[PDB]
Design a protein around this ligand. Structure first.
Ligand code: CA
Ligand code: CA
Length: 153
């Protein structure tokens, strides 16, 4: 996976799995699969569904524990875009980056948030870089819109 899963993300994987597990009787159907993935915030293509059901129903013979589910769905959870996440959750994430609540994310705020996400400290050159790639109005701070673009394609 691109990074470790945070506790709130394991929690929604939990919820999705509880749904998945209750649904499943030998095989999981693509209707049920899609819905359990949406429960953790992910909008799948039909092709993704066909593929994952294949893996559950054919490769894993329908045998899937929490841990398999995390390996399978973790990468999807992590690839959720601004458009799947919705504004309330985007704003909530921003508010955790923006710890002094001023409405912008500073380099120290960024450094601290990256550390929390990646589980290691991030170089000063890296940060002042990230800021350069992300800051669209040159004010050396990141606003909501620039944060949201930071997770948009
Ligand atoms: Ca701030
Ligand atoms: Ca800016």
């Amino acid at each position: 996976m691109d990074r470790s899963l945070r506790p709130e993300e394991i929690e929604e994987l939990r919820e999705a799995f509880r749904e998945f597990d209750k649904d499943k009787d030998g095989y999981i159907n693509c209707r049920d699969l899609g819905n359990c993935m949406r429960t953790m915030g992910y909008m799948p293509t039909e092709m993704e569904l066909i593929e994952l059901s294949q893996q559950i129903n054919m490769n894993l013979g329908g045998h899937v524990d929490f841990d398999d589910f995390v390996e399978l769905m973790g990468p999807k959870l992590l690839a959720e875009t601004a458009d799947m996440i919705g504004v309330k959750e985007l704003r909530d994430a921003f508010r955790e980056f923006d710890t002094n609540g001023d409405g912008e994310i500073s380099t120290s705020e960024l450094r601290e948030a990256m550390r929390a996400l990646l589980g290691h400290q991030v170089g000063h050159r890296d940060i002042e870089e990230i800021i350069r790639d992300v800051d669209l109005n040159g004010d050396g701070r990141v606003d909501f819109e620039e944060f949201v673009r930071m997770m948009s394609r």
